Amino acid sequence: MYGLVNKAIQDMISKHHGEDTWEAIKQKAGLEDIDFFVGMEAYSDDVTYHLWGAASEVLGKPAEELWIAFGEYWVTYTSEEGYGELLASAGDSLPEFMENLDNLHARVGLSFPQLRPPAFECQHTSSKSMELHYQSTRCGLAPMVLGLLHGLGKRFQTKVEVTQTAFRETGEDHDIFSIKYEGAENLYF
Numbered sequence: 001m002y003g004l005v006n007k008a009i010q011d012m013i014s015k016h017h018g019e020d021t022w023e024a025i026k027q028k029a030g031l032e033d034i035d036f037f038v039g040m041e042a043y044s045d046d047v048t049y050h051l052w053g054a055a056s057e058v059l060g061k062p063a064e065e066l067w068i069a070f071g072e073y074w075v076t077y078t079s080e081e082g083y084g085e086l087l088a089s090a091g092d093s094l095p096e097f098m099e100n101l102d103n104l105h106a107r108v109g110l111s112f113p114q115l116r117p118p119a120f121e122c123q124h125t126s127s128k129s130m131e132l133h134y135q136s137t138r139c140g141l142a143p144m145v146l147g148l149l150h151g152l153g154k155r156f157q158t159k160v161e162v163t164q165t166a167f168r169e170t171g172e173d174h175d176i177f178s179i180k181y182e183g184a185e186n187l188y189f
């Protein structure tokens with residue numbers, strides 16, 4: 001993964017648990033040679049997997065729980081580190097935005113020439129619901145989609161219930177999320 005991701009992890013951890021913890025984590029994972037992470041430079045995935053392995057131990061939090069928090073941060077992080085207009089161009093509501101994910105990652109591809117993006121297909125069972133299909137070149141990142149989907153609720157001021165209905169690990173083609181989403185009707189009635 002690009003340093004861009006590894007820095008978000010760093011900033012997320014430093015923001016939440018302080019710098020000295022982040023330094024412990026960085027030490028335990030085996031990556032003290034790196035004085036810092038470079039956004040537009042590809043690194044081996046291991047760096048990432050390894051950080052979370054260290055983080056998980058040092059913070060006593062399971063991996064699943066870290067990725068989830070990370071999915072939410074990412075959304076915010078990318079919009080603040082200067083990809084906010086990409087985000088804005090991608091959609092004006094939650095359903096619209098899901099359709100344009102492959103496209104957005106293809107536009108991101110021009111700045112990140114070695115990207116290996118996820119693939120999402122959206123199927124709109126109605127205006128309060130969809131299935132989301134998530135295909136990836138990597139293992140185990142479905143918790144991160146949970147985090148993102150929640151971060152997208154907040155983005156569109158929508159309440160989103162997400163439940164994973166297919167798990168790749170049990171022998172499916174890809175992970176599938178069933179997502180319920182309501183606006184303010186939730187609140188008023």
Ligand code: HEM
Nearest residue numbers: 001002078083086087108115116117118136137138141148
């Ligand atoms: C401008 C916004 C975004 C940028 C710049 C961005 C960029 C990236 C980058 C650099 C990676 C690492 C890929 C690699 O190093 O090979 C990545 C991974 C990922 N991105 Fe985004 N992305 C953005 C928005 C989103 C959004 C909104 C979602 C919402 C679902 C999303 C879902 C993911 C997922 C799931 C991965 C995991 C990779 C995998 O499954 O193989 N991204 N993205």
